[PDB]
Every structure is written in structure tokens, then in C-alpha cells.
Amino acid sequence: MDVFLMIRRHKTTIFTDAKESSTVFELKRIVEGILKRPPDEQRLYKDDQLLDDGKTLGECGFTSQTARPQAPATVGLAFRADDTFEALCIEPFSSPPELPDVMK
Amino acid sequence: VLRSVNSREPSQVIFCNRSPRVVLPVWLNFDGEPQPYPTLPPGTGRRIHSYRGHLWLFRDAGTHDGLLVNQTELFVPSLNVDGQPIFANITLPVYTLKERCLQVVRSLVKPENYRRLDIVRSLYEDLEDHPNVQKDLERLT
Amino acid sequence: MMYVKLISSDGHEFIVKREHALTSGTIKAMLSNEVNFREIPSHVLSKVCMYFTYKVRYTNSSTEIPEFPIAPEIALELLMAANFLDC
Numbered sequence: 001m002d003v004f005l006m007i008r009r010h011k012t013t014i015f016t017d018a019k020e021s022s023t024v025f026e027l028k029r030i031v032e033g034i035l036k037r038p039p040d041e042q043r044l045y046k047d048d049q050l051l052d053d054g055k056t057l058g059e060c061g062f063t064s065q066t067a068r069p070q071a072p073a074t075v076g077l078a079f080r081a082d083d084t085f086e087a088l089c090i091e092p093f094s095s096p097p098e099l100p101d102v103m104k
Numbered sequence: 105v106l107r108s109v110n111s112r113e114p115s116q117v118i119f120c121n122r123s124p125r126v127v128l129p130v131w132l133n134f135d136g137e138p139q140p141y142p143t144l145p146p147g148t149g150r151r152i153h154s155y156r157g158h159l160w161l162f163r164d165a166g167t168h169d170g171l172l173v174n175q176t177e178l179f180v181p182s183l184n185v186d187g188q189p190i191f192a193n194i195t196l197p198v199y200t201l202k203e204r205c206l207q208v209v210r211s212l213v214k215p216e217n218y219r220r221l222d223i224v225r226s227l228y229e230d231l232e233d234h235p236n237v238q239k240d241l242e243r244l245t
Numbered sequence: 246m247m248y249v250k251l252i253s254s255d256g257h258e259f260i261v262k263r264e265h266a267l268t269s270g271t272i273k274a275m276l277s278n279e280v281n282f283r284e285i286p287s288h289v290l291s292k293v294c295m296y297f298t299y300k301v302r303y304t305n306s307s308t309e310i311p312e313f314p315i316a317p318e319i320a321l322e323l324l325m326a327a328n329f330l331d332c
């Protein structure tokens with residue numbers, strides 16, 4: 001079963017899919033192909049939780065019914081600058097304006 | 105041009121609403137005119153009596169947004185084989201993002217205030233040109 | 246796979262498949278690997294990128310199609326974006 005993901009780090013936001021049966025490490029390989037950083041320099045998160053390389057996305061809560069195309073699930077990403085890992089930072093999206101008078 | 109064939113060969117049908125909208129079945133009668141039928145709530149079905157060669161199409165009851173029936177615009181009852189009804193699956197189309205954005209904007213603003221919105225005059229004309237059954241029958245024809 | 250970068254007014258960088266972004270004729274022209282949008286904020290452009298995924302998933306499928314959701318707060322800005330993008 002396909003799961004649909006937003007992988008997020010600072011202002012970067014990848015949109016991709018993976019199988020529910022695929023691993024966290026396999027998703028890191030996908031990030032490697034796009035952002036040119038290998039799995040060892042990567043750290044994937046679900047909310048505040050670090051994920052383990054050998055665990056499937058399904059085991060980490062990404063199911064085909066929560067991680068939908070129209071409303072995909074977020075996966076935090078953090079890089080290693082040489083020595084140690086940076087803190088997980090996801091820049092929030094912009095604020096919408098106030099609902100105009102006519103839309104209330 | 106688009107009219108039901110007056111065959112008088114009965115055809116039993118299941119209108120099955122696999123959409124989140126309240127569905128309004130529209131029969132195109134023998135002189136071309138759209139006749140409305142009772143509404144189907146979302147996820148409900150009705151076993152109905154129609155005839156072969158009759159023409160139906162399906163709309164959102166509240167906004168007249170177009171729905172599909174068996175992947176297409178129009179549904180025609182075929183011959184019942186095995187004494188068994190023909191299945192008529194009413195579903196959403198994959199609307200364009202633009203038309204979907206129009207639907208939501210239409211559902212939040214009343215017709216009077218479309219001109220007050222801060223958008224191009226091309227979009228007032230798209231907003232006011234709401235889905236309509238006579239419009240679509242002229243296209244198909 | 247082949248990816249492209251779509252950049253919002255506020256500097257957010259959305260990386261999506263090239264197939265998905267070519268849905269929009271405007272983006273295809275803007276390419277023919279990154280495309281900066283001066284007028285589309287990130288809260289709008291993420292819904293656009295969600296719509297691409299949605300549209301590629303459910304086009305040519307007899308599975309029940311769900312309603313593509315749009316919050317009331319972002320409907321005007323998304324309308325204006327789709328009208329520009331033609332998707």
C-alpha cells in the first residue's frame with residue numbers, strides 16, 4: 001500500500017510516496033537521491049520521535065489511510081554538519097489572511 | 105437531440121451514491137427536457153425502475169456540480185441479464201483545482217457579494233457561471 | 246526519479262516529481278529545474294503540490310474518489326493560484 005509523505009527540513013519540503021512495507025532507511029535513500037546527503041548524515045522524525053532505520057513506515061505510524069495524497073503525513077528530517085546532528089527544525093508555512101467579511 | 109428513447113422495455117437499476125454529495129438524478133425525457141428525481145443522500149442507494157435507452161445524468165442537489173456515473177457523463181440502462189439490475193455508480197470526478205476552488209468559494213459567499221471579492225473580473229464571470237444542467241446539455245449536443 | 250523545485254513567495258522550497266508539476270501548463274512553460282513564485286505563498290503552494298499528488302493518484306481509477314479538501318481561509322488565494330497555473 002502506498003503512503004504519501006511530506007519530508008520536511010527547515011524550508012525544504014519534499015513530496016513523495018513509499019510502500020507501507022518499506023523501511024525508514026529506504027526513505028533515507030530517497031532523500032539521498034533528491035537532497036544529495038547520505039543516510040548516515042540524515043535523521044528522520046515523526047513529530048519529536050527519532051525513527052529507526054530497519055523499521056517499516058507502517059510500524060512508525062505511516063498508514064495508507066492517514067498518509068493520503070490530498071493530506072499527506074509529515075516526516076521530519078535533520079542533517080549532520082560534520083561532527084554532530086542539528087536540532088529538528090521545520091519552518092511553518094505562511095499564515096493565511098483573515099476571512100473577508102463576505103466569507104462569514 | 106439528447107432525449108430518452110421511448111422503448112418501453114423495463115430496466116431495473118441501482119443508483120449507488122459513492123460520493124460525499126447529496127445526489128440529484130436527472131432524467132432526460134422524451135422531448136429533451138430534464139426531469140428531476142428524488143435525491144440520494146451520500147453513501148445511499150435506491151433500486152429504481154427505468155427503461156432501456158433512457159438517459160440519466162447526476163448532479164450535486166445543492167450546487168448542481170457535475171458528478172460521474174460509471175466513469176462518464178450519461179448513463180443508459182442496458183439489458184438486464186440473469187434477471188439482475190444494472191449498477192449505476194455515482195462518484196465524484198477529479199475536479200480541476202480551479203473548479204474545486206470555485207465550489208468552495210461559491211459555498212461560502214452568497215451570489216450578491218461575488219463582485220465585492222478582491223479578484224480579477226475573469227473570476228467573477230467564472231463564479232457567477234455556476235454549474236447548470238441546460239448549459240451542459242447544449243455542450244454535449 | 247526526476248524532481249523539480251517549486252519556490253513560494255516566502256522562500257519555502259517544495260520538491261515534487263517532474264511528472265506531477267507538468268500537470269500545470271504554466272509550470273511546463275516556466276521550465277521549457279527550479280521555478281520561483283513571487284505571488285503564491287507557502288500555505289497555498291503546499292495545497293497545490295498536494296493537489297498534484299491527489300490528481301495523479303485518482304485520475305483513471307474506479308476506486309471511490311474522496312473530496313479534495315480546501316479550508317475556507319485559503320480558498321481565494323488557491324483559486325487565484327490555480328487560475329494562474331491552469332490546473
Ligand SMILES: CC(=O)N[C@@H](C)C(=O)N1C[C@H](O)C[C@H]1C(=O)NCc1ccc(-c2scnc2C)cc1
Pocket residue numbers: 119129131141142143144150152153154155158
Ligand atoms: C412511460 C415512462 O417511461 N414514463 C417515465 C416518466 C417513467 O416512468 N420513468 C422515466 C425513468 O426511466 C424512470 C421512470 C420512473 O419515473 N420510475 C419511477 C421512479 C421513481 C423514483 C425513483 C427514484 S430516483 C431516486 N430515488 C427514487 C425513489 C426512480 C424511478
